[PDB]
Amino acid sequence: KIEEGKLVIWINGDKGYNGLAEVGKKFEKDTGIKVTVEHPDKLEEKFPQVAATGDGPDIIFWAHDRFGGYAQSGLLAEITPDKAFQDKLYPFTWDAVRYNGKLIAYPIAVEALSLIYNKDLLPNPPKTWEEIPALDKELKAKGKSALMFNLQEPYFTWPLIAADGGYAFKYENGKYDIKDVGVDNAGAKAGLTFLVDLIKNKHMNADTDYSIAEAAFNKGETAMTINGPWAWSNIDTSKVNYGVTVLPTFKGQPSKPFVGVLSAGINAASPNKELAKEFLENYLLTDEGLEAVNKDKPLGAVALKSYEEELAKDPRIAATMENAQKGEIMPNIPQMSAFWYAVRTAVINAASGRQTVDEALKDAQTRITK
């Protein structure tokens, strides 16, 4: 089901697909081949399924953490750029899309969660997690709340779990040791207990998801939320007077978000590798290609140095870079998806009272290490 002569791109629904569509149109305008951009639900799970058949998109966008597993299944072409092109992007973004010494994708953007706050309702954001219960009780007196964020997805809670010492896989020599997993140590247990105490004492609800939290913030019902740059767009249309700052510390330690590098990989089963390379290197990864996407939903701190130089004056980009620096670049090993599924279950079970914190995280460590 090759087709040929066209490009099909999958990208997640939260990202600037309509912008990327613009960039596709221009490529189609001066090259003649059509580019259809789609955003299937559950594309990152679908990809290893369809592309296994020899079908699916020519180009697949997702954070880099999924890209080791795809590479291990031989689903991605090795990419090949001259030293000149490589010099156009930041080096650490290349490291993230290397699997077994090979490059498996092009880096586009560096993503890190920030604290987003309603300046009108809250001139100074808290410096610490510990001062959030008190802040909530003040605000509830006026029918507002302190903080709502998506609790269904472990990506949003990880920064608190990691803060006092939790980790995914220990980095040994050049390897991650997949048997040394830090989701059940004292640091992780401290962080998840805190969150669970926030819910027990009605400072937020176990059921809050991405939509609930986004609506509460953008209507001015909650003073704070935790999200990444793709969310800024929807806030601007609400005209809420917002700032974007460092995440609060916990026990004196910085919150530590897992940093994701938005990457684009070429399906090894594509009859269109050359057209794919062309589109990416010469259309998308230019100041003009990147701004068209950014205009639709912001990318974050972008991998292309020339555009980042223009973006870096923005205090939002500055905050994004400050949280990224306190955080850690995710592994891209195949075991990352196993990690995520276990942790997701642990958080949801702990937050809902189905399990104690200690039970939840012990299960997760057992599930991850086999």
Ligand X SMILES: OC[C@H]1O[C@H](O[C@H]2[C@H](O)[C@@H](O)[C@@H](O[C@H]3[C@H](O)[C@@H](O)[C@@H](O[C@H]4[C@H](O)[C@@H](O)[C@@H](O)O[C@@H]4CO)O[C@@H]3CO)O[C@@H]2CO)[C@H](O)[C@@H](O)[C@@H]1O
List interacting residues with ligand X (CB under 6 A): 12, 14, 42, 44-45, 63, 65-66, 111, 153-155, 228, 260, 337, 340-341, 344
Contacts of 106 (CB under 8 A, 6+ apart): 79, 81, 97, 263, 264, 280, 281, 285
Taking the complex as a whole, how short is the minimal distance between the CB of residue 153 and ligand X, in angstroms? 4
Which residue, 118 or 152, has its beta carbon nearer to ligand X? 152
Which residue, 126 or 331, has its beta carbon nearer to ligand X? 331
In the chain the beta strands, taken as DSSP E runs, fall at 7-10, 35-38, 59-63, 98-99, 102-103, 106-111, 114-118, 145-147, 167-171, 176-182, 222-227, 242-245, 258-266, 301-302, 328-329
Taking the complex as a whole, how short is the minimal distance between the CB of residue 65 and ligand X, in angstroms? 5
Taking the complex as a whole, how short is the minimal distance between the CB of residue 334 and ligand X, in angstroms? 11
Q: Closest Cα to residue 225, out of 280, 145, 282?
A: 145
User: Tokens 């809050």 sit at which residue?
Assistant: 208
Compute the distance between CA of residue 94 and CA of residue 303 in angstroms, rounded to an integer: 9
Taking the complex as a whole, how short is the minimal distance between the CB of residue 54 and ligand X, in angstroms? 22
Taking the complex as a whole, how short is the minimal distance between the CB of residue 50 and ligand X, in angstroms? 15
> DSSP secondary-structure letter at 131?
G
Across-strand partners of 242? 118
Taking the complex as a whole, how short is the minimal distance between the CB of residue 71 and ligand X, in angstroms? 14
CA distances to 16, 76, 268, 280, 293 from 105, rounded to whole Å, are 19, 8, 11, 10, 18
> DSSP secondary-structure letter at 105?
S
Which residue, 157 or 245, has its beta carbon nearer to ligand X? 157
Which residue, 258 or 307, has its beta carbon nearer to ligand X? 258
Which residue, 204 or 275, has its beta carbon nearer to ligand X? 204
Which residue, 146 or 348, has its beta carbon nearer to ligand X? 348
